[PDB]
Design a binder for this molecule. Structure first.
Ligand SMILES: OC[C@H]1O[C@H](O[C@H]2O[C@H](CO)[C@@H](O)[C@H](O)[C@H]2O)[C@H](O)[C@@H](O)[C@@H]1O
Ligand SMILES: OC[C@H]1O[C@H](O[C@H]2O[C@H](CO)[C@@H](O)[C@H](O)[C@H]2O)[C@H](O)[C@@H](O)[C@@H]1O
Length: 711
């Protein structure tokens, strides 16, 4: 059942008005249907037509936003009673009564239709069902601090002219907004030959001159609107006094252009102010998906292997005890890599010893200070002797603080001259300071580490990486540490002294910690209690009744070929044990004391005791009630796995000639029992039960089947 009527998460629409019903409730005698109302009706129809539940809840959140916006724009509308009722219906259809704290956290995020709420509710439901790891609370914390996701949208929702030939990220709808700002960029000495009396008058010149030269190529004005194709972060790292001065290679013009964009922006977020709604939404959902990946990557990271090589208290002295050349040999030939801190001192040391790295097989240089998503192609251009790398060039000027000689430039130059691969592993999204928040820092670091894993720890590669210290070693993560590039890549991080000494950079204890948290308001744990919800559906037999024949593969696949014969011998022994057969029970309800007797005989047979297993589920009863039903088994332990020994399974429907004692690996046992019994929302705990602990063993209560129970 991929869409079960018994799932609490079925997103049922029984309590949500259809468009025809809305039409009568929201009708106003003299008022024709405006554009806002039409789009509300259209979206309501799409919701009711939606068969894919994830899309359905997505559309519902979008409708909530439409209503929010309408309420804000028309506070005296006589349609508001109907719209508010509809909004409450959608809230109740999505957020069940036991999800109050979740609902509050998620629906407090502005722009309910941005994708954030959809993603967060999807994650929450998967977490509650036991289909994803604990992540919702921390993904909410990320969303709440993120300068895009948490910002009430104030950008551009209009259409994009077909003349535009690049993907648009930002639009300034009315160019006159540039004349509203305090600074008169038109008075500045650099633009006196142009003869212009306003900021908006300078604008066409700045762009045209850019296009013909190199910079701001993805900016166009059409009919009083400015369309931008360069990302905020791309512009920030390629445009500054370092790269843009009077008489400089890129002159003042891009800086002037960007400076007034930022003045227009004011106290708003850049994307909040200027993004197209489309780019805004994409950014929201991409960031949440990437963060989730980063968080997942930190889960159960084992620091043991890394600490065994580099984590001894005296590793730094051992590193320092080697000559420089012995260190280079060890990094290249044994570790297959090394990282240096982001400093010009480190880069100069590397370049001064470059021959030695090359002689020991160096294949590649990687740096986090350039974004691959913007300049990887241009880097490839530089390396091949092309001149098409102006953005790269500007970015280098920024990195080198305008220094012509510049370490980053020199590093790149050396890769070309020496035919060594050069890789950017930075990722531009969310890369602009301030990094005054550990979630933004984690997001940014995670994307860089992900790229480095994909591109750097590969057979036949000997590499050096240059990165900011915050990327190198561990930093605070979500409920646990975020390991650094160096931990993930199995290499040491290093730094070069003011004395020019090359030394180890230890992973300090104070950084290898979780981010410090305050509980989210009234938060309830989402993850289920014990063992496992098998599925939020009714289970059924696929074929007919299981048989010993059908069960054989499950047994032989549970163990390696060399343990197979011994396993089958033990299974034969149990099935042919006189005392075990005496224990066989098949009258429903009278077998509750069987499992401890089975465990006792297994012990006397010399087998290893298992914890056992229990399964419980819901069953339809007369007058729309549901009862809990359960079963339990002892087990023996062999080759690391538990095997149910269930001498009372014949109390349940079965093949006519079935064996009296059911033996399967515990998971296969649970599945068989659930299917035979047409179990609804079955739940497994990996311990055998007797007496009260068995009789009242029931699935998590949120899984007891419910009506949609609205209007
Ligand atoms: O955009 C409309 C309002 O949306 C949010 O508030 C709603 O959702 C909260 C969480 O469920 C409720 O506490 C609140 O009563 C609802 O109005 C947002 O927090 C508000 O600032 C918006 O005005
Ligand atoms: O630019 C200020 C306005 O920003 C918001 O409106 C934009 O975003 C909405 C949702 O994408 C669109 O429906 C609307 O067309 C856009 O202009 C904000 O909602 C407005 O109150 C502001 O005036």
């Amino acid at each position: 059942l991929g869409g079960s009527p018994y799932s609490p998460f079925r997103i049922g629409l029984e309590g949500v008005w259809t468009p025809e019903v809305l039409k009568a409730r929201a009708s106003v005698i003299g008022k024709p249907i405006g554009e806002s109302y039409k789009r509300i009706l259209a979206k309501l129809q799409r919701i009711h037509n939606s068969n894919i539940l994830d899309e359905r809840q997505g559309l519902m959140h979008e409708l909530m936003e439409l209503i929010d916006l309408y309420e804000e724009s028309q506070p005296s509308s006589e349609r508001l009673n109907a719209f508010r009722e509809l909004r409450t219906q959608l809230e109740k259809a999505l957020y069940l009564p036991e999800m109050e704290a979740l609902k509050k956290q998620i629906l407090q995020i502005p722009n309910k239709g941005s994708g954030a709420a959809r993603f967060l509710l999807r994650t929450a439901m998967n977490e509650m069902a036991g289909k994803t790891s604990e992540s919702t609370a921390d993904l909410i914390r990320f969303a709440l601090q993120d300068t895009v996701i948490s910002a009430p949208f104030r950008g551009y929702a209009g259409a994009i002219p077909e003349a535009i030939d690049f993907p648009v990220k930002y639009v300034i709808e009315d160019i006159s907004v540039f004349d509203k700002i305090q600074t008169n960029y038109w008075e500045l000495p650099a633009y006196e030959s142009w003869n212009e009396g306003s900021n908006s008058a300078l604008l066409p010149g700045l762009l045209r001159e850019s296009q013909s030269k190199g910079m701001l190529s993805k900016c166009r004005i059409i009919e009083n609107s400015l369309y931008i194709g360069h990302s905020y972060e791309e512009m920030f790292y390629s445009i500054s006094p370092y790269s843009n001065q009077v008489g400089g290679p890129y002159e003042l013009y891009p800086f002037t252009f960007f400076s007034m964009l930022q003045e227009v922006q004011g106290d708003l977020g850049f994307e909040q102010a200027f993004a197209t709604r489309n780019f805004f939404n994409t950014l929201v959902s991409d960031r949440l998906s990437l963060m989730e990946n980063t968080m997942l990557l930190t889960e159960s990271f084992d620091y043991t292997p890394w600490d065994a090589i580099y984590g001894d208290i005296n590793y730094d002295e051992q590193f320092a005890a080697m000559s420089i050349n012995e260190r280079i040999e060890k990094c290249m030939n044994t570790y297959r890599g090394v990282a240096f801190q982001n400093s010009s001192k480190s880069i100069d040391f590397f370049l001064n010893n470059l021959t030695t790295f090359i002689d020991n097989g160096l294949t590649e240089i990687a740096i986090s200070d350039l974004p691959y998503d913007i300049v990887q192609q241009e880097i490839s251009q530089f390396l091949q002797g092309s001149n098409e790398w102006k953005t790269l060039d500007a970015m280098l000027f920024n990195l080198d603080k305008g220094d012509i000689n510049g370490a980053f430039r020199k590093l790149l130059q050396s890769a070309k001259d020496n035919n060594i691969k050069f890789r950017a592993i930075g990722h531009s999204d969310n890369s602009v300071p301030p990094f005054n928040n550990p979630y933004k820092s984690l997001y940014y670091k995670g994307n860089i580490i992900a790229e480095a894993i994909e591109k750097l720890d590969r057979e036949g590669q000997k590499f050096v990486v240059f990165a900011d210290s915050s990327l190198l070693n561990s930093t605070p993560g979500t409920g646990r540490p975020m390991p650094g590039l160096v931990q993930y890549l199995k290499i040491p991080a290093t730094v070069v002294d003011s004395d020019g000494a090359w030394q180890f950079l230890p992973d300090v204890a104070s950084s290898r910690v979780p981010i410090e948290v305050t509980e989210l308001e009234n938060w309830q744990v989402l993850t289920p209690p014990q063992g496992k919800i098998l599925g939020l559906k009714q289970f059924k037999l696929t074929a007919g009744f299981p048989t010993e024949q059908s069960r054989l593969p499950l047994l032989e696949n549970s163990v390696s070929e060399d343990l197979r014969e011994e396993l089958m011998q033990k299974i034969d022994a149990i099935k042919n044990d006189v005392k075990m057969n005496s224990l066989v029970c098949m009258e429903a309800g009278s077998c509750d004391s069987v499992s401890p007797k089975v465990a006792a005989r297994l012990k006397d047979m010399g087998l290893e005791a298992g914890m056992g297993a229990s399964i419980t589920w819901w069953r339809r009863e007369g007058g729309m009630e549901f009862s809990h039903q359960m079963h339990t088994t002892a087990s023996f332990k062999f080759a690391g796995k538990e095997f149910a020994v269930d001498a009372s399974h014949l109390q349940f429907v079965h093949d006519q000639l079935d064996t009296t004692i059911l033996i399967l690996p515990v998971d296969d046992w649970a599945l068989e029992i659930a299917q035979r019994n047409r179990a609804i929302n079955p739940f497994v705990e990996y311990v055998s039960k007797t007496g009260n602990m068995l009789a009242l063993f029931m699935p998590p209560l949120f899984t007891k089947p419910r009506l949609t129970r609205a209007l």
